[PDB]
From a paper:
Because of the flexibility exhibited by this complex, we performed 3D reconstruction of the individual Huc lobe from two datasets, obtaining resolutions of 1.52 Å and 1.67 Å. The head group of menaquinone is stabilized by hydrogen bonding between its oxygen groups and the terminal hydroxyl of Tyr301 and the backbone carbonyl of Lys212, as well as π–π interactions with Tyr229 of HucS. In our 1.67 Å reconstruction, Tyr229 adopts a second conformation that clashes with density corresponding to menaquinone, which shields the proximal [3Fe–4S] cluster from the solvent and may mitigate O2 reduction in the absence of menaquinone, which would lead to the formation of reactive oxygen species. Although the narrow hydrophobic gas channels greatly kinetically favour H2 diffusion over O2, Fourier transform infrared (FTIR) spectroscopy analysis and the cryo-EM structure indicate that the active site of Huc isolated in ambient air is in an oxidized state with a bridging hydroxide ligand. The FTIR vibrational frequencies are consistent with an electron-deficient Ni-B species.
Here we determined the cryo-electron microscopy structure of the Mycobacterium smegmatis hydrogenase Huc and investigated its mechanism. Huc is a highly efficient oxygen-insensitive enzyme that couples oxidation of atmospheric H2 to the hydrogenation of the respiratory electron carrier menaquinone. Huc uses narrow hydrophobic gas channels to selectively bind atmospheric H2 at the expense of O2, and 3 [3Fe–4S] clusters modulate the properties of the enzyme so that atmospheric H2 oxidation is energetically feasible. The Huc catalytic subunits form an octameric 833 kDa complex around a membrane-associated stalk, which transports and reduces menaquinone 94 Å from the membrane.
Numbering used by the authors:
A (entry chain C), D (entry chain F): 4 to 516
B (entry chain D), C (entry chain G): 2 to 323
Write the structure that this text describes.
């Protein structure tokens, strides 16, 4: 059965999913990003800092992430100096946006599918409906409402969220005051207490972060009623009951560009020094092995994308030349997503899944420096049960406690008397690479400044990595492979497709930009 | 009141801003104010054919559509086909045609929907336009003479993104029987939000008054106004951004970021051409090319010279201190 | 951090304002920031001897007192006995003497505690004074040289009442290891709140700039600045009232009420003498007796004349429209 | 046993209570208001509108009520015109302050005493502790936190709360916009939903307002689990279990000056037309009979108060001449409270209890006009079980649903294009009477303007009515008589005294001003 699902909403943009179904299982899948705005085209010729305005408008939910990496793209292009406070503020705001994204996505975009009638037979279904039904769910409402709190912190430093551009080469535009920081701490602490610990975890962030193995997590669920009936404990039990741990595996290979710089280690942003300075470590996990991320290995294929092109392009030489979808479909193109691929030695240019799971895998790599996220939990989970909708979601949710603690510490690290901005030299020429871990994964800008104008500007967003179509080798993108193998109980409401696409927290406006 | 919220060439920033609503928050708005959100690409439960059934019922009049909210641009490329924005089996613009013609009220939320916004920046690859405007030029996709069934033009809730209150309070107004209290300016923006300027309530107006410029970002923004060195469009931008604070905390200009004038139909102003980003374009190095709304260069500069002379000492010092 | 909050000649408005705290709210402050509120007349559970036991233990050093918050005046009448304020078996001023000498930090919250405030208005029947100030005159009840055990003078959180943030954020600062970030102005007010003016962020500053006066209350306040006809002390008053909005909504001056200058030690200014309430005292009918801080009448009036001439049309029209 | 309790906190100011106890029962009581500021003295000679600034500073919790009646005192003194919108805004803000006071007082001041160890034997004690323990109580925290919401509405119209003076002769200073009203509605609706209906009632305000008899209220508690376990249902059951319905009866005579004017009926405030224009009806209930309130009948006795004076004074001729408490105690004076008495025909100058219960009794008077509160509930409750701590508290809590509905309607009544202010003539001479129902009851200003200055200014606050000492006839004040008959299980923690004093929501800073 060929099934074309349109729209597959709650992926922050326009997505159609075509699947071939045999015996109630997806055997092939096509993700079709359906809406193109062309920001890379628009940015050509604009002011070198136009990206700080334009790139946040790639996405409303992860615009702050776009701002972060666009700023660092300029910071690297212009060889700027970043005062530690600016790095801290950038870290805080990037993390705060993600902390907003985590519950907002989980409740408003993902968990309402847990109420699907396919699960009516589950003993947990009534509770799932009570908790996660859209708008009226008892977990939905506070989860969604409180998700605005972390971006209040963003607004304290950036003026507003979404839609600030306050991250500029050389630092940030703002100059936090004491009451800014104390309020940011208060907002974060309240949000942590009222959503993260009370509703999501039913325990302290510290207790959750003590989970180092999958068995730890299972013990955590059963440890006491609070954790058992928390949103996290319920979600795990629900997943294990309804089978969300049994599909959505995907590529099993992961890309994290990392984000969050240790302020002392990235005071002078360079492409080369980027990895060592990261707190949230970059890392490529492929064929069960850890590799260092190197932006030079990134290519974008447009073979099945609605763009002209005959070879994968590293984004520094990237091009965004749309073809009419009517013509492109005649050439087998089916998506406005480019196909980002990553050259892994011995594997060729492979699709890599990006996102929290990729980050958690990267965080389990050996040889973490002291400032760096060193977390074996998802190495263990990956080996124990492998990837799945549940594991992917747990990776996302796992970042809530981890990022909250980082933000809380970064807020304490702010030295309010110290500089937040070093006026950079706006060089007429420059090649910049900025990358961050948006909520959804590796988010990267490759910018070429020439003659005090944007010569090239190539954004590769995490969902582009995940949802980008087949490459020249016909290798399915991560979400496409994750969709393959998914059961389809009801072709009329193929919620499992939604589960898989949304387990990546897919953002289609970011996918295409 | 049924609400159908569609996204064309959107980044979903207006939805994300909208979800930051407080008083009412979005859940209480959707649930407790009698506003039946039929579907929203970011929030609607229905997918695939169940979603399209909702859309077609609204488009064909099978079920009432009281408020059609459109976010993002009306993408007309390629070649007027709109296929750079294929939604639910149609070019989004065709949905827009049908749903705007079906709704009692059409709300464009965000510059993209209102005026074309960033995607309509040259070279405008997506052939983006606003619902009833292309930038300042009235017309846009629906034409200058479009009226919803309640007789209103597209209500333009501009911004990039719109502040949640700019739409939620309008929705509350519509839900509480105060639609007749909603007046729209010449750009169809609610005057209750868009008679003020961004500058209105900016914490730097005293510096503006005394022509004391912020000189640098970061700690440089502990003093001064952003108008002179950072291209703040605050005095030329109609918004309540410093009356109704963003995220109940701040605003661009309070934080030290120049107002980009995003509530104005020309946004991004000057199409982010080189030299115009976070910079004040000046004539002869001292005269701003653009002076505050309703002023002229001669009287503005004259008053500015006098203000510079009268400037008290505190206006020359840090005020947003640690 | 133990906190003992006492009330002398108070109206409890600072407590009530404090209870409006958000981010943090008062419960999260009391519970989740490690601030052990030993007792508060409006909130403490203990009464009678159980309460006095808490007080005496703090007064005598049996248990540590980290923050002594005093609200309301130090009532010294009659005849210096303080018996117009008998609290827990003593004149409140004696408690103040003991607890201020015991605390690591002493916070006067509200003008009453800071400067004597309204009860210290003539004829001051209660012999009210502030902790370390009587109006502008440094000294008050504790003397100019009083220092808490952390070496600080009384921290003056002025206002009538103080905005909750003016104390909660200081409490958060003290609780999060940022006490060293707290700088105090010459009145011992936290400069993080009291370097700005009430006018800073007022929605009427543009009207102030162009010398466009609000002429009447009610709908008259849809335009204009309150400085000229309603005695707004905004430009002479250090506060963040228009930076950090009251009740997360508004401020006096935004709403159309003149700033009374309540954060300043002279409040109520002119002791509410006839003709000074909601009126601008003027010389020769046109010159304000008091000009904005740091300005002089000559340059202020000169600039005002120029501003009046340069004034754009919108500054002469309603802006806070329905 | 003579027991002197000092301090008896959580009465918004300085209160000492002396009681004589015989066989574990209070047989006589003295309330000692212990702190004097002398605002009536200060106001003499000040600008006629100084009261609008000074009187709110009588009290932080009911300053808005002081502002309301101070404004109307000027409105009557100056024969002003009140545009209906101004009346509406005044009504809204007065009611919003009360809506804030109701939960803030109930949880923070009153209900934490329900956790007293005297109740450890009650089967509901653990739940009472879970719900109402100070700061950590599960009802305490949201109750107290959400109590800030109604005064956000106040701030929307008045600029701030507390401490606005935006109610001026001729209207209000503010000019609400559309977003002001819509936000006010949203805030109110959220507060109603999240505290009043969800936490307090466990049902709709409408369902609660259907309770017309005491039996209705008892049926309401038992009707379903939501109402049974609501804060209201629990409080009633707790009161009936621990005996809060068995003492704190008090005078059984009541004074309501009323407040909330029907805008069309008080466009030209006069003393004489005041009663007819009231929505929240005035009314004196004494010896089981209804009387019309008449400010002329009010006197203040200082026989046992620390003031000079030899005869009860109507406040228009009032005087506030402090005596040294050392001297006054030698003359049997014991309180800074004056003793307000009310001339009821056939009863002489009697103490009248003020507060919600007084209002609810007044609301049960016959011949209510269409605009007027007509509610038989507390006539029935009074006849069924009589006054008590529980009934007094229920009267207070009963106003939450009633006032919420009024405010919601008043917000709808606002005609935003219409005037909010009619510039009055500031007459050099004038006698003004302003009165409102502050949260705690009849709050009244008698002002005499002479020579464009305040000649006399006499405030009589509700707790002055309630807590004022014995008059010249040695007749105990309402709280004093309410204390008499109270059991005293533990003289070391005489919580029942606290229950009784706090059941009046006593405000000692208002008492003395
Ligand atoms: C001409 C001019 C000079 C300034 O320094 C200045 C500073 C701040 C705002 C505006 C101005 C301005 O217009
Ligand atoms: C002299 C003068 C005249 C005004 O009209 C005016 C209006 C608004 C604010 C200030 C002023 C002012 O100072
Ligand atoms: N998170 C996020 Fe948006 C995506 N994909 C980016 O970058
Ligand atoms: N409520 C209240 Fe305050 C008292 N008593 C007044 O008036
Ligand atoms: S927020 Fe986004 S939807 Fe358009 S208006 Fe701005 S780019
Ligand atoms: S007053 Fe503010 S709005 Fe801009 S022009 Fe100056 S920073
Ligand atoms: S850029 Fe837009 S959001 Fe406000 S501060 Fe300027 S109108
Ligand atoms: S609020 Fe009250 S306690 Fe004093 S400072 Fe003002 S009169
Ligand atoms: S600008 Fe505002 S602070 Fe007062 S002086 Fe004018 S109303
Ligand atoms: S009176 Fe006070 S509260 Fe602010 S607006 Fe003026 S400093
Ligand atoms: Mg790209
Ligand atoms: Mg009095
Ligand atoms: Ni995105
Ligand atoms: Ni009071």
């Amino acid at each position: 059965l060929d099934l074309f699902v349109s729209p597959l909403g709650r992926v922050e943009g326009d997505l159609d999913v075509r699947v071939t179904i045999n015996d109630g299982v997806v055997t092939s899948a096509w993700t079709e990003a359906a809406m193109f705005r062309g920001f890379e085209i628009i940015l050509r010729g604009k002011d070198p800092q136009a990206g700080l305005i334009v790139c946040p408008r790639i996405c409303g939910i992860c615009g702050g992430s776009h701002l972060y990496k666009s700023a660092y793209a300029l910071d690297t292009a212009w060889r700027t100096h970043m005062p530690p406070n600016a790095t801290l503020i950038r870290n805080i705001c990037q993390a705060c946006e993600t902390l907003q994204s985590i519950p907002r996505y989980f409740y408003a975009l993902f968990a309402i599918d847990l109420t699907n009638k396919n699960y009516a037979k589950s003993k947990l279904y009534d509770e799932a409906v009570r908790r996660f039904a859209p708008y009226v769910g008892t977990s939905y409402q506070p989860g969604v409402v409180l998700s605005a709190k972390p971006v209040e912190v963003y607004a304290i430093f950036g003026g507003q969220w979404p839609x600030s551009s306050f991250m500029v080469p050389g630092g940030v535009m703002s100059a936090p005051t004491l009451s800014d920081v104390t309020r940011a701490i208060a907002i974060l602490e309240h949000w942590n207490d009222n959503w993260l610990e009370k509703q999501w975890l039913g325990c302290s962030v510290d207790r959750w972060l003590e989970n180092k193995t999958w068995n730890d997590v299972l013990a955590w669920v059963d440890e006491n009623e609070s954790q058992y009936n928390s949103d996290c404990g319920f979600f795990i039990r629900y997943c294990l009951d309804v089978g969300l741990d049994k599909y959505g595996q995907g590529v099993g290979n992961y890309l994290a560009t990392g984000t969050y710089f240790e302020p002392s280690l990235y005071e002078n942003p360079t492409i080369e020094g980027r990895n060592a300075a990261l707190i949230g470590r970059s890392g490529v996990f492929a064929d069960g092995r850890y590799f260092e991320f190197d932006q030079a290995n990134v290519t974008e294929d447009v073979t099945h994308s609605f763009y002209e092109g005959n070879r994968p392009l590293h984004p520094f030489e990237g091009e965004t030349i749309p073809v009419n979808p009517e013509d492109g479909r005649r050439q087998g193109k089916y998506s406005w997503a480019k196909s980002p691929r990553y050259a892994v030695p011995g594997l060729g240019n492979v699709p890599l899944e990006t996102g929290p799971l990729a980050r958690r895998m990267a965080a389990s790599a050996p040889d973490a420096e002291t400032h760096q996220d060193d977390d074996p939990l998802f190495a263990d989970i990956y080996n124990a049960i492998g990837p799945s909708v549940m594991v992917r979601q747990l990776a996302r949710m796992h970042e809530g406690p981890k990022y909250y603690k980082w933000v809380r510490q970064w807020l304490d690290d702010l030295e309010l008397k110290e500089s937040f901005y070093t006026k950079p030299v706006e060089y007429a020429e420059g090649k910049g690479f900025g990358s961050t871990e948006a909520a959804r994964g590796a988010l990267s800008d490759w910018i070429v400044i020439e003659d005090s104008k944007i010569k090239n500007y190539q954004v590769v967003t995490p969902t582009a990595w995940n949802i980008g179509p087949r490459d020249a080798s016909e290798v399915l993108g991560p979400i496409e492979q994750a969709l393959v193998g998914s059961p389809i109980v009801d072709a009329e409401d193929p919620v499992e497709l939604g589960h898989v696409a949304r387990s990546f927290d897919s953002c289609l406006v970011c996918t295409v930009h | 009141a049924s609400v159908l919220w569609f996204q064309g060439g959107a980044c979903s920033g207006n939805t994300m801003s909208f979800l930051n609503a407080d008083e009412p928050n979005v859940v209480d708005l959707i649930v407790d104010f009698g506003l039946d959100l039929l579907w929203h690409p970011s929030l609607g439960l229905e997918l695939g054919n169940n979603a399209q059934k909702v859309f077609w019922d609204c488009a064909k009049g099978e079920r009432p559509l009281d408020i059609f909210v459109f976010e993002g641009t009306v993408i007309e490329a390629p070649n007027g086909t709109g296929q750079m924005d294929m939604f639910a089996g149609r070019p989004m613009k065709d949905w827009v045609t049908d749903l705007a013609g079906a709704a009692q009220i059409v709300v464009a939320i965000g510059d993209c929907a209102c005026f074309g916004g960033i995607p309509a920046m040259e070279p405008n690859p997506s052939g983006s336009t606003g619902l009833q405007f292309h930038k300042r030029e009235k017309g846009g996709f629906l034409g200058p003479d479009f009226r919803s069934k309640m007789g209103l033009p597209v209500i333009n809730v501009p911004g990039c993104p719109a502040h949640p209150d700019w739409i939620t309070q309008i929705l509350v107004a519509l839900a509480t029987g105060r639609a007749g209290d909603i007046t729209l300016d010449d750009l169809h923006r609610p005057e209750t939000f868009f008679k003020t300027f961004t500058q209105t309530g900016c914490t730097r107006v005293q510096f503006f008054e005394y022509k004391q410029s912020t000189l640098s970002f970061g700690e440089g923004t502990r003093t001064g106004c952003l108008f002179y060195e950072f291209g703040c469009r605050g005095p030329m931008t109609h918004s309540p951004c410093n009356r109704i604070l963003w995220n109940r905390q701040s605003s661009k200009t309070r934080a030290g970021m120049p107002c980009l004038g995003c509530t104005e139909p020309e946004f991004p102003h000057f199409d982010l051409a080189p030299g115009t980003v976070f910079k004040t374009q000046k004539v002869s190095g001292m005269i701003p090319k653009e002076v505050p709304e309703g002023t002229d260069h001669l009287t503005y500069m004259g008053l500015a010279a006098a203000a510079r002379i009268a400037a008290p000492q505190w206006s020359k010092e840090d005020m947003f201190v640690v």
